[PDB]
From a paper:
Coronavirus 3CLpro is a cysteine protease that has two N-terminal domains containing two β-barrel chymotrypsin-like folds. The polyproteins are processed by a 3C-like protease [3CLpro or main protease (MPro)] (11 cleavage sites) and a papain-like protease (PLpro) (3 cleavage sites), resulting in 16 mature nonstructural proteins, including an RNA-dependent RNA polymerase (RdRp). X-ray crystallography confirmed the mechanism of action of the inhibitors, which involves formation of a covalent bond between the active site cysteine and the carbonyl carbon of the aldehyde.
Inspection of previously obtained crystal structures of the dipeptidyl compounds in a complex with coronavirus 3CLpro revealed the potential to achieve enhanced binding interactions with the S4 subsite by introducing diverse functionalities at the cap position in the inhibitors. In the current study, a new dipeptidyl series focusing on the design of structural variants in the cap substructure were synthesized and evaluated for their activity against coronavirus 3CLpro.
Author numbering:
A (entry chain B): -1 to 72, 78 to 301
B (entry chain A): -1 to 72, 78 to 300
The structure:
């Protein structure tokens, strides 16, 4: 039986109306136009020559307001400033389609939508999970920097990601809108190695609840492992710490299966399912969130 | 190495702008507002009581324009007609933000984006493949009927799907905008014969090409199988006819691996990968298209 549990993105219209193209000399990428501000990655300021030890403090100083061209396809720059790894450009027109929005950094295991853009033109949307090593997967090619990731709660869009780079292993990372880069990473063109990844325990729990909700519960036993004992075990077996939420608790209540029974199950299934399947899979899945499961199965 | 091959949907803004809620007596669902026309599933006319064998012709006759209420959240009806399994409602105001559009009927193996809506409010977007048995997977709950699926050629939206129903196995089907149901399913709440799914061979080929481009070519041998023998093989082993395309050919040029090498490979890998992996999987994947792979890699 098909669960109906699929990778689902937020509708992108609200964010499509905010996307612009930013150009600084030879470099062109994408920007986010909210009210009188345009956000974009600061390496738009760097010529490909100096991309390996860029001196951003001196590059900023050398710019005037005319150094920046902002175009809308899907504007006059009257101020410029640097905030971490992002530029904050002030323009003389307030975006007439600015959504209600917040800037909140996301934590590992959280899911968000990405609107992939090239030259200020939205081309596609997909959902990603911030991994415990502060990378995301997804699809990003040359020119995609400035593409934004976001969630939506009510009328309020939370902008949480602005795309910056791709790593050697093909994963990706970027900034939060406070200007910090997710994970270590520096916006320089140099080899950077990401930390070891980990399974997102709370998302595995959610997925196993989805399985129970879908009729697949051969893996449930009376046996239980406590949260504290699971987290001790998790440090040493490449799982994140489990933190519960009202969202998980809703699934426990709905199914009548306690969280602690699923943490025990995870300790057994970790290694393989010995010929059985769960939701058409033979390994644990950690990219669906409790919120995903509550939305799409109930 | 993460290949960068993901399930990508079209930006939904253009379509969000056309979504409305349609109410008829006690039922409500979603509709599509293009110019002066609102499209919605005709079972909006059916009371819950009588969803097993509705008399749609008599329901339509029983109606008047004032039976139907249309509201845009994300409107007065002055005409109403039935086209197959859909209603075509004429409203007095034209949708100003009507995108350039056409109506197309997707074929099995083809991908399209879905805007899932409840009460006229877009809530989510995902991509599906029309399966060889004319169903789709996706995520659709109560109130989702009237959600639409679409492709894009340029700035032009091709509307191909309006959601109608769920089958006992959890899969879904809907109407094309000419009013016909994909796969001849009836918009009646009754058990119906669902054919068996098959592997979309052309998408399997595209996936193997993606593996090659990602530096996973362990399965590539100089051995070759012709299209016609493969297609003969495919009938007895739950695969679809392979039909080449310019998109596929681009991939054999990019990689330098010929189609027939991969058709031979499919015949071997169908039995299992024998301890090895392809793009993190131990089974063949058939929901990424030639167009996906070219676009994303
Ligand atoms: C801005 O559009 C790009 C996005 C890259 C391009 C290729 N795929 C992407 O996601 N960002 C960068 O190019 C970035 C600039 C520095 C200054 C941060 N550098 C970068 O991502 O380089 C990568 C390119 C890919 C290779 C392959 C492993 C490694 C370095
Ligand atoms: C219109 O919004 C719904 C969408 C369904 C409902 C639940 N999930 C969906 O995809 N369509 C219907 O409700 C449909 C109406 C008839 C007149 C076509 N009925 C329907 O899909 O019946 C299904 C419901 C689930 C059961 C499962 C054994 C089979 C029949």
């Amino acid at each position: 039986h098909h669960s109906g549990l699929v990778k689902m993105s937020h509708p992108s219209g609200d964010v499509e109306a905010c996307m612009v193209q930013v150009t600084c000399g030879s470099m062109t990428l994408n920007g986010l136009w909210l009210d009188n501000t345009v956000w974009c990655p600061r390496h738009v300021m760097c010529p490909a020559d100096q991309l390996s030890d860029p001196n951003y403090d001196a590059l900023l100083i050398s710019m005037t307001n005319h150094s920046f061209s902002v175009q809308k396809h899907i504007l006059r720059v009257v101020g410029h400033a640097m905030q971490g790894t992002l530029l904050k450009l002030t323009v003389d027109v307030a975006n007439p389609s600015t959504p209600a929005y917040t800037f909140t950094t996301v934590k590992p295991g959280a899911a968000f939508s990405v609107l992939a853009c090239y030259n200020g033109r939205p081309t596609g949307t997909f959902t990603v999970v911030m991994r415990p090593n502060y990378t995301i997967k997804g699809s990003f090619l040359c020119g995609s920097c400035g593409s934004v990731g976001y969630t939506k709660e009510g009328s309020v869009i939370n902008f949480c990601y602005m795309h910056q780079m791709e790593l050697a292993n093909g994963t990706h990372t970027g900034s939060a809108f406070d200007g910090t880069m997710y994970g270590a990473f520096m916006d320089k063109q140099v080899h950077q190695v990401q930390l070891t990844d980990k399974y997102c325990s709370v998302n595995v729990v959610a997925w196993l609840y989805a399985a129970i909700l879908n009729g697949c519960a051969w893996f449930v036993k009376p046996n239980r492992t406590s949260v504290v004992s699971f987290n001790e075990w998790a440090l040493a077996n490449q799982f994140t710490e489990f933190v519960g939420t009202q969202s998980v608790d809703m699934l426990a209540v709905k199914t009548g299966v306690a969280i602690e029974q699923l943490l025990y199950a995870i300790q057994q299934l970790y290694t393989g399912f010995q010929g059985k399947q769960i939701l058409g899979s033979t390994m644990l899945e950690d990219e669906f969130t409790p919120e995903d499961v509550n939305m799409q199965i109930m």
